[PDB]
Structures are given as structure tokens and as C-alpha cells.
Amino acid sequence: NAPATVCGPKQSTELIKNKCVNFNFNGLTGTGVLTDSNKKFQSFQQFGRDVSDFTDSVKDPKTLEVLDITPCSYGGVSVITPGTNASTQVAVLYQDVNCTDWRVYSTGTNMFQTQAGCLIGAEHVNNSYDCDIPIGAGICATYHTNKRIVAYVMSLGAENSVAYSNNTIAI
Amino acid sequence: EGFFLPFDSNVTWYSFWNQKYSVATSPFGDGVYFSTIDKSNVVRGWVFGTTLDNDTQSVLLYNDGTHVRVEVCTFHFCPTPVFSASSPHLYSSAFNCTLNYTLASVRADFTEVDGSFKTIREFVFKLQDGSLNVYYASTSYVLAIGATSQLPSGVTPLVPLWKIPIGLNITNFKTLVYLRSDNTPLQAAYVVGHLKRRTMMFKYDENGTIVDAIDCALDPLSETKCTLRSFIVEKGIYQTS
Amino acid sequence: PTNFTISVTTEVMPVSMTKTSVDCTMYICGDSVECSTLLLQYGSFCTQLNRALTGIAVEQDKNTQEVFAQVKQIYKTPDIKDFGGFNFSQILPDPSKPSKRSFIEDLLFNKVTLADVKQYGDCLGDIQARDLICAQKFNGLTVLPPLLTDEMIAAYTAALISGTATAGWTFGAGAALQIPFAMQMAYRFNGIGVTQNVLYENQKLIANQFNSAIGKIQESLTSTASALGKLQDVVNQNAQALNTLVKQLSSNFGAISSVLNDIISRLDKVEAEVQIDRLITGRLQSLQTYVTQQLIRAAEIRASANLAATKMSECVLGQSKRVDFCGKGYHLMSFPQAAPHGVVFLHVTYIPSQERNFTTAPAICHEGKAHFPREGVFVSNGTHWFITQRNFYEPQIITTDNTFVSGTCDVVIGIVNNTVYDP
Amino acid sequence: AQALNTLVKQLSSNFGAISSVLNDIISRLDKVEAEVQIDRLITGRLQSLQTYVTQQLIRAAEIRASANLAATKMSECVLGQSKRVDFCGKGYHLMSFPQAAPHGVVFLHVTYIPSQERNFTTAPAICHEGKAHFPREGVFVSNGTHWFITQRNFYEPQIITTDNTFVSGTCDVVIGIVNNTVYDP
Ligand SMILES: C=CC1=C(C)/C(=C/c2[nH]c(/C=C3N=C(/C=C4\NC(=O)C(C)=C4C=C)C(C)=C\3CCC(=O)O)c(CCC(=O)O)c2C)NC1=O
Ligand SMILES: *[C@@H]1O[C@H](CO)[C@@H](O[C@@H]2O[C@H](CO)[C@@H](O)[C@H](O)[C@H]2NC(C)=O)[C@H](O)[C@H]1NC(C)=O
Ligand SMILES: *[C@@H]1O[C@H](CO)[C@@H](O)[C@H](O)[C@H]1NC(C)=O
Ligand SMILES: *[C@@H]1O[C@H](CO)[C@@H](O)[C@H](O)[C@H]1NC(C)=O
Ligand SMILES: *[C@@H]1O[C@H](CO)[C@@H](O)[C@H](O)[C@H]1NC(C)=O
Ligand SMILES: *[C@@H]1O[C@H](CO)[C@@H](O)[C@H](O)[C@H]1NC(C)=O
Ligand SMILES: *[C@@H]1O[C@H](CO)[C@@H](O)[C@H](O)[C@H]1NC(C)=O
Ligand SMILES: *[C@@H]1O[C@H](CO)[C@@H](O)[C@H](O)[C@H]1NC(C)=O
Ligand SMILES: *[C@@H]1O[C@H](CO)[C@@H](O)[C@H](O)[C@H]1NC(C)=O
């Protein structure tokens, strides 16, 4: 909870920044990414707190500069699949990845941004069918013909037009 | 929530000019608030204890001119212990003394400074598990030598300075000043408050400093600010405790 | 009444709320492997929570689909927005503008802050901003996008309008039948009990009143911002629940600390398990409370969306005889407008005004028989007796075509002797 | 069924105790330290039952809303003819027939869907003389040469008659009025 001058004998490694590491600052262990911070600790403070009680910053005991601590796990992931006993291939939607050119499991071969996240494993088609598997933000997916997962913009309905006239009626 | 000085509380102001001198032993109940308004280095330190005689031991925390010393000794204190300029006229004898070390190297001269009051030095002394915790803040505060004897507006957060393991019972405390050349001391003032167990809400700015605290359970508006976790209250009806 | 007012009023209805999903293993434990195990005993509860949240998220898209996608014929916006003097330009998209929304729709979308995509580098490079969305997502609280974008909802609205401007009420029931807008407005006037000759005689005045009411609607939502308070409350509740979920991670729940790292670093794996189990129970309780309140809000939102779909069917796709269901007054037309997390209905109503006192009689004793009015009431201007329709003063000569004969005139209380014309 | 089976499956949760089985705890521990584990299990299982009851209450509220809508449809679509658009099927509602279903009701809405439309030149009114003629019911249509009056939802043309129309005002005010003749019997 405070700066300390009595410690057990463990080790003193170098600082690893911009990388998810297992840290140990004055006995406080945890995992996260250490980055340089624009925070000024008041010399009686060793750790910082967020709106929760999570330790989001720390004062390095050797070089007295504040380091931010952020979790290295982040970003929503969704799986797009047809049925089991229909196919085994899947498409993965990474909601918080901008792959328009990563934090993805596999780079695949099909990549395009959908405004609901990065879609990997489904090829874009210019056709507009009805929705089969809803992806989000106007994008749907289906298992369509050799069979593959395709992603498309959903169609709102049949295109129509009414021949409006000021002297014609339809009975 | 902890031990805090309540807002707009009854606090006692003690004045010093060339005709009067007031160092009366204030009680130490659940911690005290101390604040000296001073143009020079008059209020040297404090004496903490129960009877302040030689039957029990006492804490002698003071500035000798160049260091801040704390002595937990059993003193035969002189009546009205003072400093005759830089010479400590504090005690006649000191024995059986369990703590004697310096806390900080602070150069504070005993020279008289003419003019008006310049700074306010605010202290919070509280006892936690046998240790005397000291909280300190210094703010520039220009006060004249008449027509007003009030405390400054706004807040100033006191930073935790020391944890002194005095390890003894404290019920009373006494302030000590310097007497110049054994006359009535110069222009100085000190305020003594008493902490109470209260909840309070603190607002931290973007730089991490406390600004604009509020006293929870002072009035129902402050309790509403407490419940809302905010310092802005919109117009409407609010249930309180 | 001797005059009328064409009134256009707004009705703001929430339709959908924000879809959300929760990673329990991210919320209950930060990245602690020691907390990931001993959470395996609580996996059924988290599958239950995610099942409830998935049901809510699917129901939100179902709510949006049932309100706006009533008709699947996307009728094209006409090149001319003037239909017999009625100016439809403010409620239809402007082809000269880059946004494919109406002017009213743009004003509506500017009036909601929409504070609930992101990237890991964006949260990593903006730590000092202390963004609430970053704090939500670092604790496993994600917001899923709606299936229908605002462009598609605006396209559905722009297809509902101009299907009713060119074909009127006849495209929600079968294929669209075109009709001149003046004749369809005469039909709407006939629907509320006003003869259609009033519409044809005052077409310019009625169109001017309609355009002025549309302009009054436009200006009241370039001014006051409290009109969209229901949608803003939906957004604020959905943000406040997630922020409360983030803030509730600081609760100790009876443990020595609310921080898993502090407990793991100070205690070995006989005594850290007790405090970790206390924290797991408390955080699972917080997630369960959040999911339960989300279910309550989803039920309320679904009721509002069902009402909005009923208003779409009965006020936009047809003319409703129900009192105050489609605005105050006699309902003529309704135009939907796409709004964030909801819909805004522009209810065009007929307000009779400028009433005049008239001496009236229930029936007329012209002879031994009695005459009762077919449609309307008997009125007298002091000397002569006329028959007029109820909602507009149009005095007519009392003829045998205007009235009908039923019985003698000695049994009607208030009977008045007057002549009846016979051609 | 899923709610009941989830309630059954949640009995395997340890809830922070040494075991999820009461028999194991009773067999291994005496009644001073089995009590805390049994209390943990009691708290967890009571929480599971409370969660089940809360979700049942929410689902019952949804089911009650659906049943109220179904009763309203029984009153207004089966026991009468509804003028509300799309309340009883798509189209102009004629009649509805209820069918008993497990846990619900199935309504067979008989509706009138007009079809096979034709284009017609139309007019708001007829200027037969100095006065103007407006149709009592339906619209004025023209087959190219002659003018007729027909009902709105079905093409049944007939000649314009003083009984078919009504007179209101002069004919110089109506926009789009055409010139024709009105038969007088
Ligand atoms: C007796 C207790 C006592 C306390 C708690 C104390 C604290 C204290 N005094 C300071 C400065 C100072 N404060 C004082 C004087 C005083 N200020 C006081 O609180 C009092 C009572 C005096 C003395 C009468 C002066 C003159 C300085 C040094 C300023 C300088 O030379 O930079 C500082 C800042 C040191 C720095 O920034 O490096 C601290 C922490 N000083 C003390 O003497
Ligand atoms: C702790 O020790 C380290 C290692 O000796 C100190 O870091 C050195 O500091 C000096 C003086 O500022 C620099 O010239 C060196 O380049 C630093 N070396 C490294 C490897 O960083 C550090 O200052 C010490 N910290 C404290 C608080 O005493
Ligand atoms: C992704 O990056 C591109 C880089 O050009 C940027 O234009 C875009 O706004 C970003 N976001 C999305 C959701 O595509
Ligand atoms: C799909 O449309 C894009 C954008 O217009 C175009 O570049 C691409 O060639 C099209 N692909 C086809 C027609 O296979
Ligand atoms: C203790 O104080 C008393 C007065 O109370 C005094 O007479 C005595 O000399 C003192 N003793 C010492 C050792 O200081
Ligand atoms: C404390 O120690 C100093 C020297 O370090 C000495 O001068 C002083 O008298 C001591 N104080 C006592 C015994 O009270
Ligand atoms: C924080 O400190 C900076 C200088 O480091 C100063 O410019 C800024 O005003 C301070 N912020 C506040 C809110 O006082
Ligand atoms: C009806 O009111 C309008 C608007 O005030 C006015 O222009 C018009 O003359 C009125 N009509 C009658 C018949 O009074
Ligand atoms: C409709 O109103 C807009 C402004 O609200 C105006 O620019 C436009 O000319 C109007 N249309 C007609 C046909 O008068």
C-alpha cells in the first residue's frame, strides 16, 4: 500500500514495456502491459487505482517513474459456423480489430472490415440475400456454393416503384 | 470515512502579540487539527502526553532551528516551556527516554519578520495503533494584524508526513513557541481543532491532487452529494437517510 | 365548428436498447489463473447469464425488425416532393445531401448523444483520458452492434413514406394502388366525418397548414432537446448499468481485499482460496443483478416496441378511428421518422376550431310525419332551419334526400315545426 | 425444460465448499466444520432457486402480455370484424377462426386481398354545369372515352347519376375537375 524499503531477496530484472508480462512491483504480482505514464506520484504513493480497486499504475522502485498497467486481454470474439454435420469450417469475427490494412487467432485468407469488426474466414460477395446468420451492422452470412461461408450485405426487401400521377388511379 | 475535522466546526483561535500569551493545554481527543498562521518561525513544536509531569513520559516534537527532533522521554517540564530565542528552555531533566531521533532537516531561523502574516501551516495529529501520524500542508495566506481572525477559504490537502512510534497514551497536548529575548512573543496565531469519526467525499483532479472535498452527514444536501458520488446536484427531490 | 387546424405532433417511442454480452472470466478475474480455476464450479451460472443476454440481444433486433420492416417493397423516393401542394421534402431524404436521411431524421439523430469499433491501441494510447468504454471492455463488458444500421432503418422509413404519399393506405393490404394525393386526402377527410368537398375547396389552405406544422416540428427540435428524453433515458440507463458493473468490482464482499492481485501476493493457496471464493460469489451476484435488471428493461422495451409496431400498422399504414391512439384530434395521416434506439411518429390530425352557437332540434315536424337527419344535425341561424355536418358548418336546405321519415312528430321531445323541401 | 434441467445441473456446484455432495461433507467432517460447508451449499442452492423463480416471473410477465394480446384478438377478430390494419392478418379482415394449440392458440385470419389492378384516368369531381358533383362513395374513373363511378376496392363501373353523386358549390374551385354529364332520372 505504500513505498517500502525492506524486501525479501528475489531478483531484479529489467523493465519490459509494451508487452504482456508477469510483473512483480514491491511484492505486488500480476499480469499486464507496462507503458510510460503521464502521472505524477506524490512521493508517498507507490500504486495507483482506477474507478475500481484495480492497480492501474505503479511507481518503479529503481527509476522513480510511473508506469501504467493495462490488461493484455481485450476485444470481443465471435464464431460464425453452419451446423455441425453440415461443415467444419468457421468464420471468426473480431469486434475490436481493424484489419482494413493483428490480435487474431489466425490470419486466414479472407479479411475485410464489416463495421462490426474484422471478419476472417468468410469471403465478401456483392449479392444481397435475406439474412441467414446475422453478423451485425447490416452484414449477414450463409453457407453457399463448392460450399463455403460467404458474407454479404443484407437485403431490405424487393425493389419497387409506384408510378405516381396526379390524374391516374389504380382500381 | 475516518477521523476528520468536521466542516464549520467549533475551533479555538489563540493569539500572540507583545501583551498576551496563550499556550493552554488542549485535550487530545481522537486526534486534533493544528494550524498556525505566522509571518515567521514562531511555533516551534508541541508536547504530547497525559499529565506532562515527570510521573509519566511525554512526546517532545519540535524544530530546534535546523532539524525536526522527536523525543519520547520522561521530562521534568518547566512551567510554560518555551524557547528563549534559539536556546531551548523546555525541561530541567530528562531520563528513561525511549525515543530520540531526527525526522527531517528543516532550517527554520528564529529571526523576527516584520509586516503581516504570510503562510499558514496546517497539521493533523492522530494516534493509530500507538503511532503518532502527522499530516502536513503549507499554504501562502496573507493575514493583517487586525479586524479579521478567520481561516482561509477552500481546501488544501494535507500530505502524510511521518509515522512516529511513540507507543504511549496521549490525552493532552501543549504548544511551545519562542520567546525572543524573554519578552512576550511576537505576532503569531494558532488554531486547535478536534477530529471526529465522519464520512467525507474527496474529489481528485486529473493531476491526482485532492480539490473541493465535502463533509458527508453535515447537512442533507451534503448527504445527497455523498449518495450521488457527485458535487453537482440536479433540481429535484432526493431521499436521504 | 366553422374552421379547422391541421396539427402535426410528435410521438417518441423507444424500440430497441443496447445489445450486450459479458465475459465472466474477464469480469470476475482480471487475468488470474488462480481465479480462472475455482470458477469452473460456477460455469453453469455464467452460461445462464450469457443465454439471457443473448436472448435480449436477439429480441432487440426482433424489435427493430417488427417496427420498421413491416413492408418488404422498398418504394423509390419520387423526384418531386410536392404532392398536390403538400411539401414532403423535410420528411423524405434529399438527393442533394450526402446523408441518406431526412432533415427531420438528421435533427433527431443529432439530439441523442449515443454514448453506448474500438481498438486495443486506442485504449493503450489514451490511458490518461480514463475512457469509460475502455474500462467496460477491459472487464469483459462488450456492446454488440444492432443488425440493422441507421441507414437501413432510414431506408425503411423512406419506403414507408412515399408508399403512402403515392399509393396511400393501399399498400399494407395487397399491392400498391396509385392515387392522386388530393383524392387520397379527400378520402382521409371522409374518414373523419368531413365531406370531401371541404378538402377540395380548401386544398391550398390545408396544404399550407400542413407545411407550416411540419416547419413548426422542425424548429421545436432545432431548439428544445427534452423531446427525445425517452431515447436518451434508454441510452443513459444502458450506460449507467455498465458503469455500475465496473464500479462494483471495488467491493470487498467480506474478503480482506477487493483486489485479486493483493490477495494472491499476500496469501498462499490455502487462504487465498477463501477470499477469492468470496470475491467470485460477490462478482457473480453483481452480474446476476445486472442481467436481471437488463431482462426487466428488455421486457419494458419490448412492450414499447410492440406498441410502436401497432402504431406503424394502424397510424402509418392506415387511418385509425381510435381516439388519441394516433395523436390528439381526428387522425388523418402519420409519418414515421428513424431515431436512435426508437421511432418518432409525426401524427397529422384534424382539429376543429372556431365554433359557433346554433339553436338545434332533434327532428323536424313538417307534416303528420317526422323527419330525422341522415348525416348531421339540424341548426337554425335565428330565422331559417338548415342541416349541416357535425364537424364543419355547411348549412344546407332541408330536403327529403337530406332526411328520412320515421313515425309521427308527437313523440319526439324537442320537435320543431319547419318545412321540408321536396324536388 | 431448459430452466428445470439447468436447476438440476446447478446442484453440482461446490459454491466454495470442499464438495458439492452433502453426503461427502457429512461423512468426512463432524458437525462443527461440516456446518460451514453445508451452509455454503444452502446459500448457493437457495440463490439458484431464487434465480430460477425470478426468470420464471419475467417469462410469466411476457406470457401474460402475449395472452392478453391473444384474448384481445379473440374478442376483436373472432367475435367481430376488425377495422384495425394488420391486427387480424394482412389485408382487409373478414373473419378469424381460433384453433387450440399446446400452450397457446393459432388464429386463422380470413382476409380480403384485392388484386389485378388496372390503370384509370381519374378526376376529383365532375363539372356537369355551373355546380360541381362529388362522388358519394368511390371515385370517378374513365375508360378512355366515357366517365364512370366505381367503388374503391373493386372495379364495378356505372354511369354517373344524381343519386350516385352529390352537389356542393361551383366547379371553378376544385383543382383537376373535368367536364362530363350527370344522368338525372
Ligand atoms: C516542527 C515540525 C515541522 C514540520 C511538520 C515540518 C515539515 C516541513 N517543513 C518544510 C519546510 C519548511 N517549513 C519551515 C518551518 C516550519 N514549518 C513548520 O511546520 C514549522 C512548525 C516550522 C518551524 C517553526 C521552513 C522555514 C521550511 C524550510 C524552507 C526552505 O528552506 O526551503 C517542509 C518541506 C521540505 C522540502 O520541501 O524539502 C516540510 C515537509 N517542518 C517543521 O519544522
Ligand atoms: C538504483 O540503482 C540503479 C542501478 O545502479 C540506478 O540506475 C542508475 O542511475 C544512475 C544515476 O542516475 C545512472 O547514471 C545510471 O545510468 C542508472 N543505471 C541504470 C542501469 O538504470 C538507480 O538510479 C538507482 N535508484 C535509486 C532510487 O537509488
Ligand atoms: C480502420 O482504419 C481505417 C484506416 O484508413 C480508418 O479509415 C477507419 O475509420 C478505421 N475503422 C473502421 C471501423 O474501419
Ligand atoms: C463487387 O463490387 C466491387 C465494388 O463495386 C467491385 O470492385 C468488384 O469487382 C465486384 N465483384 C464482382 C462483380 O465479382
Ligand atoms: C519530579 O517532579 C517533582 C514535582 O512534581 C519534583 O519535586 C521532583 O524533583 C522531580 N523529580 C525529577 C527526578 O525530576
Ligand atoms: C537526544 O540525543 C541528542 C544527541 O543525538 C542529545 O543531545 C539530546 O540530549 C537527546 N535528548 C534527550 C536525552 O532528551
Ligand atoms: C495539472 O498540471 C499541469 C502542469 O503539469 C497544469 O497545466 C494543469 O492545469 C493541472 N491541472 C489542474 C486541473 O490543475
Ligand atoms: C380559418 O383559419 C385560417 C387560419 O387562421 C384563416 O386564414 C381562414 O380565413 C379561416 N377560415 C374561416 C372560414 O374563418
Ligand atoms: C419545401 O420546403 C423547402 C424548405 O422547407 C423548400 O426549399 C422547398 O422549395 C419546398 N417545396 C416546394 C415544392 O415548395
Ligand SMILES: *[C@@H]1O[C@H](CO)[C@@H](O)[C@H](O)[C@H]1NC(C)=O
Ligand atoms: C355560446 O353561448 C354561451 C352561453 O351564452 C356563451 O358563453 C358562449 O360564448 C357562446 N359561444 C360562442 C359565441 O361561440
Ligand SMILES: *[C@@H]1O[C@H](CO)[C@@H](O)[C@H](O)[C@H]1NC(C)=O
Ligand atoms: C339565415 O340564413 C338565411 C340564408 O338564406 C338568410 O336569408 C337569413 O337572413 C339568415 N338569418 C339571420 C342571419 O338571422
Ligand SMILES: *[C@@H]1O[C@H](CO)[C@@H](O)[C@H](O)[C@H]1NC(C)=O
Ligand atoms: C329545455 O329547457 C328549458 C329551460 O329549462 C325548458 O323550459 C324547456 O321546456 C326544455 N325543452 C325540452 C324540449 O325539454
Ligand SMILES: *[C@@H]1O[C@H](CO)[C@@H](O)[C@H](O)[C@H]1NC(C)=O
Ligand atoms: C399503369 O401505368 C404505369 C405507368 O405507365 C405502368 O408501369 C403500369 O404497368 C400500368 N399498369 C398497371 C396495371 O399498373
Ligand SMILES: *[C@@H]1O[C@H](CO)[C@@H](O)[C@H](O)[C@H]1NC(C)=O
Ligand atoms: C368505355 O365504355 C363505354 C361504355 O361501356 C364503351 O361504349 C366504350 O367503347 C369504352 N371505351 C373504351 C376505349 O374501351
Ligand SMILES: *[C@@H]1O[C@H](CO)[C@@H](O)[C@H](O)[C@H]1NC(C)=O
Ligand atoms: C397534372 O400534372 C401534369 C404534369 O405536371 C400537369 O400538366 C397538369 O396540369 C396537372 N393537372 C392537374 C394539377 O389537375
